[PDB]
């Protein structure tokens, strides 16, 4: 009888530890990502588009949270616009000028 309970409880606990190894690898992927967000967007200013929130990145502030982290990504977002006529270059004394 006890061989059945041991084999069952042990197969059940191996299932739990297998779940937790795979879940821990998912949380490590998220912790390495969070570490990277912190190095690039708190300690720096990232040029990686949409890596630190939508908009062009300015800075970010970390805040702690239970079992995790929150970033407040401060981003410049352009917000009103005008249509204009444009040209890639302009002539002057036969020479082409570029911006």
């Amino acid at each position: 009888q006890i061989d059945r309970l041991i084999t069952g409880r042990l197969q059940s606990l191996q299932t739990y530890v297998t779940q937790q190894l795979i879940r821990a690898a998912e949380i490590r992927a998220s912790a390495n990502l969070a570490a990277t967000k912190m190095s690039e967007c708190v300690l720096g200013q990232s040029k990686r588009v949409d890596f630190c929130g939508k908009g062009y990145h300015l800075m970010s502030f970390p805040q702690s949270a239970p079992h995790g982290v929150v970033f407040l990504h401060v981003t410049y977002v352009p917000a009103q616009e005008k249509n204009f006529t444009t040209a890639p270059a302009i002539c002057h004394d036969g020479k082409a000028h570029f911006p």
């Binding site: 006890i2 061989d3 309970l5 041991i6 409880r9 042990l10 606990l13 191996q14 739990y16 530890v17 937790q20 190894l21 879940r23 821990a24 949380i27 490590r28 998220s30 912790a31 390495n32 990502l33 969070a34 570490a35 967000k37 912190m38 190095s39 300690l43 630190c52 929130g53 939508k54 908009g55 300015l58 970390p62 702690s64 949270a65 079992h67 995790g68 982290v69 929150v70 970033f71 407040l72 990504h73 401060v74 981003t75 410049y76 977002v77 352009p78 917000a79 009103q80 616009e81 005008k82 249509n83 204009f84 006529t85 444009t86 040209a87």
Partner: protein, 426 residues
Amino acid sequence: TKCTLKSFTVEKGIYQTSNFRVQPTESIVRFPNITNLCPFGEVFNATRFASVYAWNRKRISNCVADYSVLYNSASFSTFKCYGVSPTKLNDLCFTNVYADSFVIRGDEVRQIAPGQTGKIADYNYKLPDDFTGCVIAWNSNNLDSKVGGNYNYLYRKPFERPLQSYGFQPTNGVGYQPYRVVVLSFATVCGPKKSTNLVKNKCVNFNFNGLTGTGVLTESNKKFLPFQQFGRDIADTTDAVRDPQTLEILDITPCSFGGVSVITPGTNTSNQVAVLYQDVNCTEVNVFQTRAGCLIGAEHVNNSYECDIPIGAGICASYQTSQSIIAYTMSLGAENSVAYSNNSIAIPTNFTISVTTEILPVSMTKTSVDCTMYICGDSTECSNLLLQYGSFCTQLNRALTGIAVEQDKNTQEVFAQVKQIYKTPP
């Protein structure tokens, strides 16, 4: 759904709760056209028998045991069974099928008992000391015996003659009068496998020969070779069969089944729900058909909205305006024709700062399990048995400790990138 989640409150979502599974509507049995029956009339309609001092014994093998005909033969002068019964023996089978017969007086019921006794039994017509099967007798004194009698008597092992034959006559009393004794006993010979009519396009229970199952039998175009009986799919599951009574090939398609999933707004907001029968065709079950299955109790809405509760294949559901559950094709976002041309640019005159929150997990709950206490708490008896499995509890507790130390590493990897605890200015 409440019982599925073991909770009275249910959050907004879609939940699998049961299997829809069409039940067999009736049961089908099919075997070859019944043929090569046992010629039991070679004993049970014989004109006479050899005397009990020389009683006959024979095989009864390589033929189908038509015992249902002898079971209806209530006009038999006598009948009995001991190793079986006549209600089951017409469906039973014999491993080495056999029969016996003799001419004897009506007192020979004493010769039918295992380790038989009396003059015919002591002569040769006796039953085995550990006998089996069934016994019969036929009315010889009615017409097989003339008024002068016949050699249907004997006096002192099965069918072994220390013995001699004698006369008996139809003018005698019922125990002295002659009768035609018969026996049958225990592959060699099996009773007839009865068949039903065949039924198509319904979910049905079936057996073909010994190939049992349940399925939707449909006529099919496939070309079996004449010796082939069953088809299989690529994964070796049976896909078709040959019928044993006409040369038809039937696809055994499955009986319809799928997950029942319940769409609900949160129970804090409503107690109305809508049910998705996964990959069912609605005729089999408001009602709405989708590529994901049959959706019941959701109103189909022809407009499109952002996806509230996801159903699948572009369908989503929500609770909306008197309110009810609706289902709709999801919006991907509003359309926008960007006003491109070879000489036009849009430059922004103004901006907004935005402060986009982003949220990330960094650690699990650090956990450890004493596998000796979990598997065997307080029991020395169980703890000793756990040691027969060797390294497993050591390996489990090691693996969890690996995760546990990794959580502190994760937390330091994120926050501890800074060498000094900078105070603010005042």
